[PDB]
């Protein structure tokens, strides 16, 4: 039995290495990673890989790994796939912990925009979780944390993290992580997967996929939202992505909204993430 070496970037930035039989399905590798992580609430998570274009793809657990990575290295990342709308309802602290690590990367990367005060508050809960109670001995008037809190760090942000950290004395790691999530979950881009597209007039938009539905970001004044209930059918053909928007009461016919994606693979990817979100958040 011939086995292939897999390398997985974990959410703390460390590398897990294992071997799977070369015809293994994605679920086999995912089960090994989740066992390594002591993670039971596995349904929220998945593995990604980067293609020759360094674009992110979800590894389909039901399909052979080799038929997805194809020509590429067996190199993956462990990521949150379905962001829980209410992390307080997860059954395990360790689930909330991995969700926090993913969100920290969402923030530092700039995928999850955040006000100054929310960056500082989130940063303060991470410090409380990671180091425990504020200690003046490690922090002078010139302190800069090892923790990455933001896409662009300022001394002002470092000071505000410390000021809020002082207020959390006695807070346990699970408590600070729950506070982190209660704040992060409210952010307008929480759990939103963004895809570049053109509308039917060739005007550049973003499509966001999240628990509550599909978001069309036209301009700052024009943001259309289609709750999953309002979406009857999702389709792709060539470079095009289509959604069927339900008849509103007393209307005879569904409406169709068409989008142009960069290429066929980008249309397919968007279609599959929409179907998966529609299924997952229908089970809520
Ligand atoms: C109406 C409310 C909830 C909602 C509904 C549909 C989507 Br897609 C996203 C959010 C909102 N404007 O945030």
Curated annotation (Swiss-Prot):
Subcellular localization, as worded in the UniProt entry: Cytoplasm, Cytoskeleton; Cell junction; Cell membrane; Cytoplasm
Tissue specificity field: Expressed at high levels in brain, with lower levels in kidney, intestine, and testis. Detected in lung.
Domain FERM: 4-284
Known role: Tumor suppressor that inhibits cell proliferation and promotes apoptosis. Modulates the activity of protein arginine N-methyltransferases, including PRMT3 and PRMT5.
Subunit structure: Interacts (via FERM domain) with CADM1. Interacts (via FERM domain) with PRMT3; the interaction is direct and inhibits the protein-arginine N-methyltransferase activity of PRMT3. Interacts with PRMT5. Interacts with PRMT6.
Protein name: Band 4.1-like protein 3
Gene expressing this chain: EPB41L3
Full-sequence range covered: 107 to 390 of 1087
């Amino acid at each position: 039995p011939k086995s292939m070496q897999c390398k997985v970037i974990l959410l703390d930035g460390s590398e897990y290495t294992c071997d799977v039989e070369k015809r293994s399905r994605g679920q086999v590798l995912f089960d090994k990673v989740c066992e390594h992580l002591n993670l039971l609430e596995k349904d929220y998570f998945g593995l990604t890989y980067r293609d020759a274009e360094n674009q992110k793809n979800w590894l389909d657990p039901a399909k052979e790994i080799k038929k997805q990575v194809r020509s590429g290295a067996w190199h993956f990342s462990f990521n949150v796939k379905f962001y829980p709308p209410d992390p307080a309802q997860l059954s395990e602290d360790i689930t909330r912990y991995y969700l926090c690590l993913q969100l920290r990367d969402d923030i530092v990367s700039g995928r999850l925009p955040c006000s100054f005060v929310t960056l500082a508050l989130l940063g303060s809960y991470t410090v409380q979780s990671e180091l425990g109670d504020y200690d003046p001995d490690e922090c002078g008037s010139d302190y800069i944390s090892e923790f990455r809190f933001a896409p662009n760090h300022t001394k002002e942000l470092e000071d505000k993290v410390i000021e809020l950290h002082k207020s959390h004395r006695g807070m346990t790691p699970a408590e600070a992580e729950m506070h982190f999530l209660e704040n992060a979950k409210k952010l307008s881009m929480y759990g939103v997967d963004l895809h570049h597209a053109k509308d039917s007039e060739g005007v550049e938009i973003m499509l966001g996929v999240c628990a509550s539905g599909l978001l069309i970001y036209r301009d700052r004044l024009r943001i259309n939202r289609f709750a999953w209930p309002k979406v009857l059918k999702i389709s792709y053909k060539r470079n095009n992505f289509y959604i069927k928007i339900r008849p509103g009461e007393f209307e005879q016919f569904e409406s169709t909204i068409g989008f142009k994606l960069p290429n066929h693979r980008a249309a397919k990817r968007l279609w599959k993430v929409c179907v998966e979100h529609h299924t997952f958040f229908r089970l809520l």
